[PDB]
Amino acid sequence: GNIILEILLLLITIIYSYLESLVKFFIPQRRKSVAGEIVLITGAGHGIGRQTTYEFAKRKSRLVLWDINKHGVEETAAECRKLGVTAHAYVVDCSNREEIYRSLNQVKKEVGDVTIVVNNAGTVYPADLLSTKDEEITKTFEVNILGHFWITKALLPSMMKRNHGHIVTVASVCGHEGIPYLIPYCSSKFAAVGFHRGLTSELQALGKTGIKTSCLCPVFVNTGFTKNPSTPVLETDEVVRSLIDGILTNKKMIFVPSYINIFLRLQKFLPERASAILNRMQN
Amino acid sequence: GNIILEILLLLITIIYSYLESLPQRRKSVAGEIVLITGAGHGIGRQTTYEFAKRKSRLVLWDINKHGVEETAAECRKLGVTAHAYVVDCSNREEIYRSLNQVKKEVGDVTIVVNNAGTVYPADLLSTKDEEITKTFEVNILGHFWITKALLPSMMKRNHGHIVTVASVCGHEGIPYLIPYCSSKFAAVGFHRGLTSELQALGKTGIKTSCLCPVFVNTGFTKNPLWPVLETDEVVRSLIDGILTNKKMIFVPSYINIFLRLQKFLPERASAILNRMQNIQFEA
Ligand SMILES: NC(=O)c1ccc[n+]([C@@H]2O[C@H](COP(=O)([O-])OP(=O)(O)OC[C@H]3O[C@@H](n4cnc5c(N)ncnc54)[C@H](O)[C@@H]3O)[C@@H](O)[C@H]2O)c1
Ligand SMILES: NC(=O)c1ccc[n+]([C@@H]2O[C@H](COP(=O)([O-])OP(=O)(O)OC[C@H]3O[C@@H](n4cnc5c(N)ncnc54)[C@H](O)[C@@H]3O)[C@@H](O)[C@H]2O)c1
Ligand SMILES: CCCCCCCCCCCCOCCOCCOCCOCCOCCOCCOCCOCCO
Ligand SMILES: Cc1ccc(S(=O)(=O)c2cc(C)cc(S(=O)(=O)Nc3ccc(C(=O)O)cc3)c2C)cc1
Ligand SMILES: Cc1ccc(S(=O)(=O)c2cc(C)cc(S(=O)(=O)Nc3ccc(C(=O)O)cc3)c2C)cc1
């Protein structure tokens, strides 16, 4: 039953996870400057996107804000002006491929070539698979993953030429494990994780060392995106603090909280029937 | 998170003794209505013959009219007259129209093997946006429409089997296949979510299986040297998994250990691997 092999792999995962916390704590990493960088933040009209925007504004980055909610993106750009940075706000629908391209040409003309992309815009329609609407399933994929492909394909050429860039994919713990009443959302978030993992490998194979990639995978955050969790509740400030620390230290996989990867790692040692029961309990 | 880390460990070692250290029963698929997508070649074609040998009622789907007809002809030689159809699994409306025809002519599908898949190998900047959309429409979106249509009958009877044919690319991203890996990650996520949702809905008699093989010699991608897998081995692992209700079927089975040892891949080995990846891309 590969029991000896599996006990040794369990101990290695545990020892490695322990050493990973030690290094995180005792060996502090150098943290880069994002000042002057052209930062595009999608879904910047609320929550994680709005707070992330303010962290870049504080660090004197050049900002390009995108969101479908015209009032929200304008409200974020107004607070950026108070923080000392005049942001370039646009109301762009990240589900639309043509709209993304048209708006990125406007960004090239008015602002310049984007250097850091935070693909934060996302959508969810909680329901059991048989109660879902097919239009909503398509929309979940168009925003949560297909939009990432079109924004990256458009901005990547300049980053490749310069061997300098940063692609931030905002995925979720739902990109690592599936949960009830969120099947299309988990599937689209798994695709976002896969996009980041593949992009990271391809840039490495192409020798584009200077183009960094980061993937944000937080647990339930109190932003109104969803009203209640599936399996503590995070505050937006903690997530943004972890995201900025990860971007500046070129962290590839940013779990929020950092230790949730221990749970995810240990679950790989369980049958799927057991892990599914596990993520459905409330003791 | 101390307490949950411990409940995970006690849970791991509990299932190590439950069925990991304990006369395996294999079910009968005779008389079952089996739908196999992408049945005109490779894995789908061989899987079809295994169900025909086990006296299952067969419904075959493929875009390639000649290939699906060739498979249905060999089924007749095996003793089963199959119902072959030319259906494009990327088209939501075509899937629904064809499934109404299957309901009228054959009946309610009991086992679904979502095997049809597509790939357009290229580095992200050389990909065609139509091909990126097509990769998602076939590899993941088609799984959603086929399942939503066939699931109600399986729910009513508490009996069924949803087989998701994903790939090792659903567990790790590889260069020059970013949209393909992203769509395969979504397929894995769909299976994981479906498994949890069925458990939450109390419909566990609808079993789920996810096939994740390494490179198979079927012509899906061109051959590069590196060990190659044969279609017969994959189909043998798939059938054994379906009959024994295996949820995660890696081919070969031990590639789950390889995925777990990725953090330990020596820098020298990564340099050779991402050197053969481009040596074969150039072909
Ligand atoms: N909230 C959580 O619990 C949670 C957890 C993990 C991951 N995430 C992810 O974090 C990201 C941000 O979510 P949030 O928690 O800040 O939610 P939020 O509701 O506060 O903000 C999301 C923003 O994205 C915008 N947006 C949605 N669709 C868009 C589109 N088509 N084009 C442009 N903008 C669009 C919305 O209008 C909104 O301003 C999402 O990708 C979400 O999946 C959220
Ligand atoms: N070949 C491998 O190396 C490999 C490895 C892991 C996983 N897989 C997966 O296994 C599955 C089967 O691939 P294969 O290796 O048997 O390849 P294959 O080329 O031999 O056969 C795939 C079949 O799917 C059909 N198909 C493609 N698009 C379709 C559509 N829109 N509608 C209906 N049918 C369609 C094709 O006509 C073909 O007959 C795919 O999902 C693939 O991603 C393949
Ligand atoms: C602190 C650490 C302790 C140090 C001591 C180390 C001792 C030895 C350790 C051994 C570790 C071995 O682990 C290997 C894990 O590998 C898993 C990596 O998975 C990543 C996926 O990448 C695989 C890519 O495949 C490479 C081959 O590419 C060619 C494939 O050709 C076939 C397909 O061709 C068509 C594709 O287009
Ligand atoms: C006991 C235990 C079980 C699971 C985990 S986990 O970190 O693997 C985990 C996995 C998912 C899968 C969801 C959640 S959740 O409860 O936070 N639920 C949500 C997570 C994300 C989202 C979203 O992105 O909208 C909406 C709910 C969490 C904590 C940690 C500890
Ligand atoms: C040294 C080493 C490295 C990786 C592995 S692995 O088993 O984790 C692995 C991971 C992926 C990620 C791909 C592959 S691959 O080389 O088989 N590549 C392909 C896999 C699937 C497909 C396809 O689905 O078409 C097309 C190529 C493999 C062996 C085992 C040993």
Numbering used by the authors:
A (entry chain B): 1 to 231, 235 to 286
B (entry chain A): 1 to 22, 28 to 229, 233 to 291
Show passages lifted from the paper.
Based on findings from dog HSD17B13 crystals, we changed four surface residues distant from the active site of human HSD17B13 to those of dog protein at the dog HSD17B13 crystal interface (Q60K, I62R, R71H, and E161K, human mutant) to improve the resolution of the human HSD17B13 crystals and obtained useful crystals of the human mutant HSD17B13 in complex with NAD+ and compound 2 (compound 2-human). The crystal of the compound 2-human HSD17B13 contained four HSD17B13 dimer complexes in the asymmetric unit, with 2 occupying all the protein subunits. In some subunits, long rod-shaped electron densities were observed together with those of 2 at the binding sites. We built detergent C12E8 molecules into these densities, but these densities could be from the alkyl chain of the solubilized endogenous phospholipids as well. Like 1, 2 binding also displaced the C-terminal peptides in HSD17B13. In detergent co-existing binding sites, these peptides, as extensions of the P274-N286 helices, shifted positions relative to those of the apo dog HSD17B13 to interact with bound C12E8 molecules. Like 1, the negatively charged carboxylate of 2 formed hydrogen bonds with S172 and Y185 and contacted the positively charged nicotinamide ring of NAD+ at closest distances of 3.1 Å to the C4N and C5N atoms. Observations of lipid/detergent molecules in human HSD17B13/2 complex interacting with the N-terminal helices and the helix-turn-helix motifs directly demonstrated that these structural elements are indeed responsible for membrane anchoring.
Hydroxysteroid 17-beta-dehydrogenase 13 (HSD17B13) is a hepatic lipid droplet-associated enzyme that is upregulated in patients with non-alcoholic fatty liver disease. Recently, there have been several reports that predicted loss of function variants in HSD17B13 protect against the progression of steatosis to non-alcoholic steatohepatitis with fibrosis and hepatocellular carcinoma. Here we report crystal structures of full length HSD17B13 in complex with its NAD+ cofactor, and with lipid/detergent molecules and small molecule inhibitors from two distinct series in the ligand binding pocket. The overall structure of each HSD17B13 subunit could be divided into two parts: (i) the catalytic core domain (residues 29–259) that contained the cofactor binding site and the catalytic center and (ii) the membrane anchoring domain that consisted of the N-terminal helix (N2-P28) which was highly hydrophobic and a C-terminal proximal helix-turn-helix motif (P260-N286) which formed an amphipathic patch on the protein surface.
